C-alpha cells in the first residue's frame, strides 16, 4: 500500500488519468466485493437511476440488432443487475457462472469513475470535478484523460464533465454505452460458441526484435480470418484474439517462433475487424444517434482534453464531432494502438500518470521514463470508496 502522502503529487507537472481496459474475469461472488462499496457510496443514487433505466436501452438495441437481441438473455441480466446493486447479491454460491460483458462493462466503468472521484478526494487542495477543471490552466495543473480500450468509456465521461452534475450525467452515458457494447460482444460470442469455431480466446504475446515480430504477424495472417491483433501494447508486445478452434495452432506456432503466449482475461472479440461486428457496430452507431441520453460532449465542447487509441500524439481535435460514435467504434472495431497512443501522450513530457481500474496499463518500455510520477490506484492506501454519510 502506497500512501497518497508519499506520492509528491503536489510537485506534478501535469496529470494524465489513465482509464484501464476491462481485463479480468469475474463471478457474482468476486464482483460483489467491488459492487457493494459502489452501492453504499454517495454515488448510489445516480447509479441506481442509471442501472434502472438499462432494460429500456436493451429493448431498443434488441429490435435494432435482432441477431444480438436473440443471442443473449440481456433483459434478465439487466434486471438482475438492478436488484443486485439495489438490494444485494441475494446469493453468490448457487449462481456461479463467469459474468457477461453486458454487466461487467457497466460495473467496471463505475469502478473506474468512483476510483477517479476518490482520487480527487484523496488529493484535494465539495465539487471536486469543477475544481480540477477550473484549475486546469494553473501552472502544473494541466489535466488530460486517456482511456485504454473500454477505458475510453470512463475517460470520455470524465473529459465531458465540467462539474459534479455533468460527472453523473456523462457517467450515466458511459454506463449505458458499456452495456450496449457489452451486449454486442456477448451476443457475438454466444453465436460463435454455437458453432465449430467455439467462441474466442485472447493471448498476450511478446517477442524480441523486428524479425520475430514479423514472423508473429505472418503466423496470424496465415490463420485469416480467425485471428487478429486486437491491441498493439508495447514495442514488441500485442494482444491477439482468435477462434477457439484455431487457438492451439496459433499458440503452438507462436511459441515455436520464440514468441511467448499467455492467455489474458478478455471475453469475446474486441477491436474486431470481422464483418458481423462491423455491421452490428454500424447499427449501434445509428441507434445511438436517436438518443440524447447516449451522447457525450462534442469534441469541440469537452471540459478536459482526451485521447483515442489511434496514436495521434495529441488529444482529440475540436473538429472530430460525435464522441459517442468515436468511443463505440474505437472499442468494438478499431484496432487499439496502445503503444503508439501512450508513447504519443507522454513523449517529451513529464505527466503524472494515475491509472484507474483493475489492470496495470503502462507499457514496460515506457514505464521506466515516468519514474516516480505515476501511480496505479489499486496500490493506494485508504483507496476504498467511502460509504454515503448518515
Short mmCIF file of C-alpha atoms in Angstrom, two decimals:
data_model
loop_
_atom_site.label_atom_id
_atom_site.label_comp_id
_atom_site.label_asym_id
_atom_site.label_seq_id
_atom_site.Cartn_x
_atom_site.Cartn_y
_atom_site.Cartn_z
CA UNK A 1 0.00 0.00 0.00
CA UNK A 2 1.44 3.34 -1.12
CA UNK A 3 0.15 6.38 0.80
CA UNK A 4 -1.09 9.43 -1.09
CA UNK A 5 1.10 11.48 1.28
CA UNK A 6 4.17 9.83 -0.26
CA UNK A 7 3.24 10.46 -3.90
CA UNK A 8 4.58 14.05 -4.09
CA UNK A 9 1.57 14.77 -6.31
CA UNK A 10 1.83 18.44 -5.43
CA UNK A 11 5.06 18.59 -7.45
CA UNK A 12 3.47 17.23 -10.63
CA UNK A 13 3.98 18.94 -13.98
CA UNK A 14 0.53 17.76 -15.16
CA UNK A 15 -1.80 14.75 -14.79
CA UNK A 16 -2.98 12.01 -17.08
CA UNK A 17 -5.86 9.98 -15.72
CA UNK A 18 -5.41 6.63 -17.41
CA UNK A 19 -8.57 4.55 -17.52
CA UNK A 20 -7.66 0.87 -17.76
CA UNK A 21 -9.02 -1.73 -20.18
CA UNK A 22 -11.71 -4.11 -18.97
CA UNK A 23 -9.45 -7.08 -18.46
CA UNK A 24 -10.35 -9.73 -15.90
CA UNK A 25 -12.97 -12.40 -15.33
CA UNK A 26 -15.49 -12.21 -12.52
CA UNK A 27 -18.10 -14.29 -10.74
CA UNK A 28 -21.05 -12.85 -8.85
CA UNK A 29 -19.12 -13.68 -5.66
CA UNK A 30 -15.89 -11.91 -6.68
CA UNK A 31 -17.54 -8.93 -8.33
CA UNK A 32 -19.86 -8.29 -5.36
CA UNK A 33 -16.84 -7.34 -3.24
CA UNK A 34 -16.31 -4.46 -5.70
CA UNK A 35 -20.02 -3.69 -6.20
CA UNK A 36 -21.01 -3.22 -2.56
CA UNK A 37 -18.78 -0.21 -1.88
CA UNK A 38 -20.16 1.47 -5.06
CA UNK A 39 -23.68 0.66 -3.97
CA UNK A 40 -23.23 2.09 -0.47
CA UNK A 41 -21.42 5.26 -1.54
CA UNK A 42 -22.65 8.78 -2.18
CA UNK A 43 -22.75 7.73 -5.86
CA UNK A 44 -25.57 5.28 -5.14
CA UNK A 45 -28.49 7.44 -6.18
CA UNK A 46 -27.24 8.44 -9.61
CA UNK A 47 -26.04 4.90 -10.31
CA UNK A 48 -29.39 3.38 -9.21
CA UNK A 49 -31.24 5.72 -11.58
CA UNK A 50 -28.88 4.71 -14.39
CA UNK A 51 -28.99 0.96 -13.83
CA UNK A 52 -32.79 1.01 -13.51
CA UNK A 53 -33.07 2.50 -16.99
CA UNK A 54 -30.83 0.00 -18.78
CA UNK A 55 -33.58 -2.50 -19.77
CA UNK A 56 -35.24 0.14 -21.98
CA UNK A 57 -31.98 0.74 -23.86
CA UNK A 58 -31.67 -3.01 -24.22
CA UNK A 59 -35.20 -3.16 -25.65
CA UNK A 60 -34.15 -0.65 -28.30
CA UNK A 61 -30.90 -2.48 -29.09
CA UNK A 62 -32.65 -5.86 -29.33
CA UNK A 63 -35.03 -4.68 -32.05
CA UNK A 64 -32.40 -2.66 -33.95
CA UNK A 65 -29.93 -5.53 -33.92
CA UNK A 66 -32.05 -8.70 -33.70
CA UNK A 67 -29.14 -11.16 -34.07
CA UNK A 68 -27.75 -9.78 -30.81
CA UNK A 69 -31.19 -9.39 -29.25
CA UNK A 70 -31.87 -13.11 -29.67
CA UNK A 71 -28.41 -14.35 -28.70
CA UNK A 72 -28.34 -13.47 -25.00
CA UNK A 73 -30.84 -13.05 -22.15
CA UNK A 74 -29.96 -9.38 -21.90
CA UNK A 75 -33.10 -8.01 -20.30
CA UNK A 76 -32.98 -10.53 -17.47
CA UNK A 77 -29.28 -9.94 -16.92
CA UNK A 78 -30.01 -6.22 -16.61
CA UNK A 79 -33.00 -6.51 -14.27
CA UNK A 80 -30.89 -8.88 -12.16
CA UNK A 81 -28.18 -6.17 -12.15
CA UNK A 82 -30.62 -3.61 -10.79
CA UNK A 83 -31.64 -5.94 -7.97
CA UNK A 84 -28.00 -6.78 -7.26
CA UNK A 85 -26.99 -3.13 -6.99
CA UNK A 86 -30.16 -2.02 -5.21
CA UNK A 87 -30.73 -4.79 -2.66
CA UNK A 88 -27.64 -7.00 -2.57
CA UNK A 89 -26.42 -10.14 -4.31
CA UNK A 90 -29.01 -12.45 -2.67
CA UNK A 91 -26.81 -15.44 -3.46
CA UNK A 92 -23.22 -15.85 -4.61
CA UNK A 93 -22.73 -19.62 -4.38
CA UNK A 94 -25.57 -21.15 -6.41
CA UNK A 95 -25.21 -18.71 -9.30
CA UNK A 96 -21.56 -19.46 -10.00
CA UNK A 97 -21.01 -18.56 -13.67
CA UNK A 98 -18.46 -16.08 -15.04
CA UNK A 99 -20.18 -12.72 -15.63
CA UNK A 100 -21.09 -11.44 -19.10
CA UNK A 101 -19.78 -8.18 -20.59
CA UNK A 102 -23.27 -6.67 -20.69
CA UNK A 103 -22.95 -6.49 -16.88
CA UNK A 104 -19.16 -6.35 -16.35
CA UNK A 105 -18.76 -3.37 -18.69
CA UNK A 106 -21.19 -1.15 -16.75
CA UNK A 107 -19.68 -2.24 -13.43
CA UNK A 108 -16.05 -1.64 -14.41
CA UNK A 109 -17.00 1.79 -15.78
CA UNK A 110 -18.49 2.51 -12.34
CA UNK A 111 -15.41 1.16 -10.55
CA UNK A 112 -13.17 3.43 -12.63
CA UNK A 113 -15.36 6.52 -12.22
CA UNK A 114 -15.60 6.13 -8.45
CA UNK A 115 -11.86 5.47 -8.14
CA UNK A 116 -11.26 8.67 -10.08
CA UNK A 117 -13.56 10.69 -7.80
CA UNK A 118 -11.98 9.18 -4.68
CA UNK A 119 -8.52 10.01 -6.06
CA UNK A 120 -9.60 13.64 -6.42
CA UNK A 121 -10.83 13.43 -2.81
CA UNK A 122 -7.55 11.98 -1.51
CA UNK A 123 -5.50 14.64 -3.32
CA UNK A 124 -7.81 17.67 -2.83
CA UNK A 125 -6.28 21.09 -2.00
CA UNK A 126 -17.11 19.93 -2.47
CA UNK A 127 -17.40 19.73 -6.25
CA UNK A 128 -14.06 18.10 -6.94
CA UNK A 129 -14.59 17.84 -10.70
CA UNK A 130 -15.47 21.53 -11.02
CA UNK A 131 -12.33 22.29 -9.06
CA UNK A 132 -9.91 20.25 -11.17
CA UNK A 133 -11.48 21.57 -14.38
CA UNK A 134 -11.34 25.22 -13.24
CA UNK A 135 -7.72 24.90 -12.10
CA UNK A 136 -6.52 23.10 -15.25
CA UNK A 137 -4.81 26.21 -16.62
CA UNK A 138 -2.77 26.78 -13.45
CA UNK A 139 0.96 26.04 -13.70
CA UNK A 140 1.39 22.32 -13.03
CA UNK A 141 -2.35 21.62 -13.03
CA UNK A 142 -2.99 20.58 -16.64
CA UNK A 143 -5.24 17.50 -16.78
CA UNK A 144 -5.97 15.07 -19.59
CA UNK A 145 -7.83 11.77 -19.63
CA UNK A 146 -6.61 8.75 -21.54
CA UNK A 147 -8.77 5.69 -21.98
CA UNK A 148 -7.25 2.30 -22.83
CA UNK A 149 -9.72 0.13 -24.82
CA UNK A 150 -13.05 0.16 -22.91
CA UNK A 151 -11.33 2.55 -20.52
CA UNK A 152 -12.37 5.13 -23.11
CA UNK A 153 -15.96 4.93 -21.79
CA UNK A 154 -14.97 6.35 -18.44
CA UNK A 155 -12.20 8.59 -19.78
CA UNK A 156 -14.51 10.38 -22.18
CA UNK A 157 -17.22 10.60 -19.48
CA UNK A 158 -14.81 12.48 -17.23
CA UNK A 159 -13.49 14.64 -20.09
CA UNK A 160 -17.09 15.61 -20.89
CA UNK A 161 -17.77 16.77 -17.33
CA UNK A 162 -17.28 20.30 -16.05
CA UNK A 163 -18.84 19.68 -12.63
CA UNK A 164 -20.46 17.08 -10.37
CA UNK A 165 -23.82 17.12 -12.15
CA UNK A 166 -22.14 16.54 -15.51
CA UNK A 167 -19.90 13.86 -13.97
CA UNK A 168 -23.12 12.00 -13.12
CA UNK A 169 -24.70 12.85 -16.49
CA UNK A 170 -21.86 11.58 -18.62
CA UNK A 171 -21.03 8.81 -16.17
CA UNK A 172 -24.54 7.53 -16.91
CA UNK A 173 -23.89 7.80 -20.63
CA UNK A 174 -20.74 5.69 -20.21
CA UNK A 175 -22.63 3.02 -18.28
CA UNK A 176 -25.30 2.80 -20.98
CA UNK A 177 -22.72 2.57 -23.76
CA UNK A 178 -20.76 -0.05 -21.83
CA UNK A 179 -23.92 -2.11 -21.58
CA UNK A 180 -24.63 -1.82 -25.30
CA UNK A 181 -21.04 -2.54 -26.32
CA UNK A 182 -21.06 -5.48 -23.92
CA UNK A 183 -24.23 -6.84 -25.48
CA UNK A 184 -22.63 -6.80 -28.95
CA UNK A 185 -19.58 -8.60 -27.55
CA UNK A 186 -21.64 -11.18 -25.59
CA UNK A 187 -24.11 -11.72 -28.42
CA UNK A 188 -21.43 -12.40 -30.99
CA UNK A 189 -19.61 -14.68 -28.58
CA UNK A 190 -22.80 -16.66 -27.85
CA UNK A 191 -23.43 -17.07 -31.58
CA UNK A 192 -19.81 -18.12 -32.21
CA UNK A 193 -19.90 -20.61 -29.33
CA UNK A 194 -22.77 -22.48 -31.01
CA UNK A 195 -20.52 -23.25 -33.99
CA UNK A 196 -17.46 -25.43 -34.60
CA UNK A 197 -15.27 -22.34 -34.14
CA UNK A 198 -16.27 -22.48 -30.48
CA UNK A 199 -16.07 -18.83 -29.49
CA UNK A 200 -12.95 -16.74 -28.97
CA UNK A 201 -9.86 -16.58 -26.79
CA UNK A 202 -7.22 -13.86 -26.40
CA UNK A 203 -3.50 -14.05 -25.75
CA UNK A 204 -0.89 -11.63 -24.51
CA UNK A 205 2.11 -12.25 -26.75
CA UNK A 206 5.67 -10.94 -26.66
CA UNK A 207 8.65 -11.18 -28.99
CA UNK A 208 12.16 -9.81 -29.22
CA UNK A 209 13.23 -7.79 -32.24
CA UNK A 210 11.88 -6.84 -35.66
CA UNK A 211 12.09 -10.29 -37.30
CA UNK A 212 10.18 -12.40 -34.73
CA UNK A 213 7.53 -9.69 -34.74
CA UNK A 214 7.21 -10.09 -38.49
CA UNK A 215 7.02 -13.88 -38.10
CA UNK A 216 4.28 -13.45 -35.49
CA UNK A 217 2.39 -11.28 -37.98
CA UNK A 218 2.90 -13.94 -40.66
CA UNK A 219 1.50 -16.63 -38.39
CA UNK A 220 -1.59 -14.54 -37.63
CA UNK A 221 -2.07 -13.77 -41.32
CA UNK A 222 -1.92 -17.47 -42.24
CA UNK A 223 -4.85 -18.01 -39.89
CA UNK A 224 -7.07 -15.44 -41.64
CA UNK A 225 -9.87 -14.69 -40.78
CA UNK A 226 -9.74 -16.43 -37.40
CA UNK A 227 -7.02 -14.39 -35.72
CA UNK A 228 -6.21 -10.68 -35.45
CA UNK A 229 -4.17 -8.17 -33.47
CA UNK A 230 -6.62 -6.58 -31.03
CA UNK A 231 -4.08 -4.48 -29.16
CA UNK A 232 -0.64 -3.18 -30.07
CA UNK A 233 0.57 -2.98 -26.48
CA UNK A 234 4.32 -2.28 -26.35
CA UNK A 235 7.22 -2.11 -28.81
CA UNK A 236 7.24 -5.87 -29.09
CA UNK A 237 4.01 -6.82 -27.29
CA UNK A 238 0.47 -7.37 -28.54
CA UNK A 239 -2.85 -8.94 -27.70
CA UNK A 240 -4.09 -11.41 -30.30
CA UNK A 241 -7.59 -12.86 -30.44
CA UNK A 242 -8.62 -15.98 -32.31
CA UNK A 243 -11.35 -18.61 -32.55
CA UNK A 244 -11.08 -21.48 -30.08
CA UNK A 245 -10.94 -23.97 -32.96
CA UNK A 246 -7.71 -22.38 -34.24
CA UNK A 247 -6.22 -21.31 -30.90
CA UNK A 248 -3.92 -24.32 -30.47
CA UNK A 249 -2.45 -23.71 -33.95
CA UNK A 250 -1.88 -20.07 -33.11
CA UNK A 251 -0.37 -20.76 -29.70
CA UNK A 252 1.87 -23.61 -30.81
CA UNK A 253 3.18 -21.81 -33.90
CA UNK A 254 3.89 -18.60 -31.99
CA UNK A 255 5.79 -20.44 -29.25
CA UNK A 256 7.79 -22.35 -31.87
CA UNK A 257 8.78 -18.97 -33.32
CA UNK A 258 10.11 -17.88 -29.89
CA UNK A 259 7.07 -15.72 -29.16
CA UNK A 260 5.73 -16.00 -25.61
CA UNK A 261 2.00 -16.62 -25.27
CA UNK A 262 -0.17 -16.21 -22.18
CA UNK A 263 -3.96 -16.29 -22.00
CA UNK A 264 -5.49 -12.99 -20.88
CA UNK A 265 -8.80 -12.20 -19.19
CA UNK A 266 -10.65 -10.86 -22.22
CA UNK A 267 -14.06 -12.29 -23.15
CA UNK A 268 -15.19 -12.35 -26.76
CA UNK A 269 -13.86 -10.19 -29.54
CA UNK A 270 -12.90 -6.55 -29.01
CA UNK A 271 -11.36 -4.23 -31.63
CA UNK A 272 -12.52 -6.76 -34.21
CA UNK A 273 -12.31 -6.31 -37.98
CA UNK A 274 -14.82 -9.08 -38.69
CA UNK A 275 -17.83 -8.47 -40.89
CA UNK A 276 -20.52 -9.28 -38.32
CA UNK A 277 -19.02 -6.87 -35.79
CA UNK A 278 -18.74 -4.19 -38.48
CA UNK A 279 -22.43 -4.45 -39.34
CA UNK A 280 -23.58 -4.59 -35.72
CA UNK A 281 -21.43 -1.57 -34.84
CA UNK A 282 -22.88 0.47 -37.71
CA UNK A 283 -26.36 -0.39 -36.43
CA UNK A 284 -25.41 0.57 -32.88
CA UNK A 285 -23.88 3.87 -34.02
CA UNK A 286 -27.07 4.62 -35.95
CA UNK A 287 -29.23 3.74 -32.91
CA UNK A 288 -27.26 5.99 -30.55
CA UNK A 289 -27.99 8.95 -32.84
CA UNK A 290 -31.61 8.72 -31.73
CA UNK A 291 -30.91 9.22 -28.03
CA UNK A 292 -29.83 12.45 -26.34
CA UNK A 293 -29.01 10.44 -23.23
CA UNK A 294 -26.45 8.35 -25.10
CA UNK A 295 -24.36 11.40 -26.00
CA UNK A 296 -21.00 12.53 -24.70
CA UNK A 297 -19.97 16.15 -25.10
CA UNK A 298 -18.98 17.13 -28.66
CA UNK A 299 -15.23 17.04 -29.43
CA UNK A 300 -15.40 20.84 -29.61
CA UNK A 301 -17.00 21.15 -26.18
CA UNK A 302 -15.02 18.83 -23.89
CA UNK A 303 -14.21 20.06 -20.39
CA UNK A 304 -10.83 18.29 -20.43
CA UNK A 305 -8.69 17.01 -23.30
CA UNK A 306 -8.96 13.31 -24.07
CA UNK A 307 -7.44 10.76 -26.43
CA UNK A 308 -8.48 7.99 -28.76
CA UNK A 309 -6.30 4.94 -29.26
CA UNK A 310 -5.08 5.80 -32.77
CA UNK A 311 -1.61 7.01 -31.74
CA UNK A 312 -2.33 10.64 -32.60
CA UNK A 313 0.30 12.19 -30.32
CA UNK A 314 -2.28 14.73 -29.17
CA UNK A 315 -5.71 14.80 -27.59
CA UNK A 316 -8.63 14.55 -29.97
CA UNK A 317 -9.05 17.67 -32.09
CA UNK A 318 -12.04 20.04 -32.00
CA UNK A 319 -13.31 19.04 -35.45
CA UNK A 320 -13.90 15.42 -34.55
CA UNK A 321 -17.60 15.70 -33.78
CA UNK A 322 -19.60 12.93 -32.14
CA UNK A 323 -17.66 11.37 -29.28
CA UNK A 324 -20.15 8.57 -28.65
CA UNK A 325 -19.61 7.36 -32.21
CA UNK A 326 -15.83 7.61 -31.79
CA UNK A 327 -15.79 5.68 -28.49
CA UNK A 328 -18.16 2.96 -29.75
CA UNK A 329 -16.14 2.36 -32.95
CA UNK A 330 -12.84 2.60 -31.05
CA UNK A 331 -13.82 -0.23 -28.67
CA UNK A 332 -15.80 -2.55 -30.89
CA UNK A 333 -13.98 -2.38 -34.26
CA UNK A 334 -10.86 -0.21 -34.48
CA UNK A 335 -7.51 -1.68 -33.55
CA UNK A 336 -6.14 -0.41 -30.26
CA UNK A 337 -2.69 1.05 -30.90
CA UNK A 338 -1.91 1.50 -27.22
CA UNK A 339 1.87 1.61 -27.59
CA UNK A 340 1.65 4.45 -30.11
CA UNK A 341 -1.08 6.19 -28.13
CA UNK A 342 0.69 6.11 -24.78
CA UNK A 343 4.07 7.00 -26.26
CA UNK A 344 2.35 9.83 -28.11
CA UNK A 345 0.71 11.14 -24.93
CA UNK A 346 3.85 11.14 -22.80
CA UNK A 347 6.89 11.62 -25.03
CA UNK A 348 8.76 14.85 -24.34
CA UNK A 349 6.58 15.42 -21.28
CA UNK A 350 6.63 14.52 -17.59
CA UNK A 351 2.96 13.81 -16.82
CA UNK A 352 1.90 12.31 -13.50
CA UNK A 353 0.09 9.17 -14.72
CA UNK A 354 -2.71 7.88 -12.49
CA UNK A 355 -4.30 4.58 -13.56
CA UNK A 356 -7.90 3.89 -12.56
CA UNK A 357 -9.26 0.39 -12.98
CA UNK A 358 -8.21 -3.19 -12.37
CA UNK A 359 -5.44 -3.79 -14.90
CA UNK A 360 -1.93 -2.34 -14.94
CA UNK A 361 -1.79 -0.27 -18.08
CA UNK A 362 1.59 1.37 -18.60
CA UNK A 363 3.74 -0.43 -21.19
CA UNK A 364 7.05 -1.58 -19.60
CA UNK A 365 9.35 0.15 -22.12
CA UNK A 366 7.51 3.41 -21.38
CA UNK A 367 7.04 2.96 -17.62
CA UNK A 368 10.75 3.45 -16.88
CA UNK A 369 10.85 7.05 -18.12
CA UNK A 370 7.88 8.11 -15.95
CA UNK A 371 9.97 7.40 -12.86
CA UNK A 372 8.14 8.17 -9.64
CA UNK A 373 5.41 10.39 -11.13
CA UNK A 374 2.93 7.60 -11.68
CA UNK A 375 0.61 5.52 -9.53
CA UNK A 376 -1.72 2.60 -10.09
CA UNK A 377 -4.79 3.35 -8.00
CA UNK A 378 -5.14 -0.25 -6.70
CA UNK A 379 -1.82 0.25 -4.92
CA UNK A 380 -3.05 3.19 -2.80
CA UNK A 381 -3.79 3.03 0.89
CA UNK A 382 -7.22 4.26 2.02
CA UNK A 383 -8.49 3.71 -1.52
CA UNK A 384 -11.87 2.25 -0.63
CA UNK A 385 -14.98 4.08 -1.76
CA UNK A 386 -16.41 5.72 1.38
CA UNK A 387 -19.97 4.85 2.41
CA UNK A 388 -22.54 7.63 2.00
CA UNK A 389 -22.85 9.77 5.14
CA UNK A 390 -25.65 9.03 7.66
#
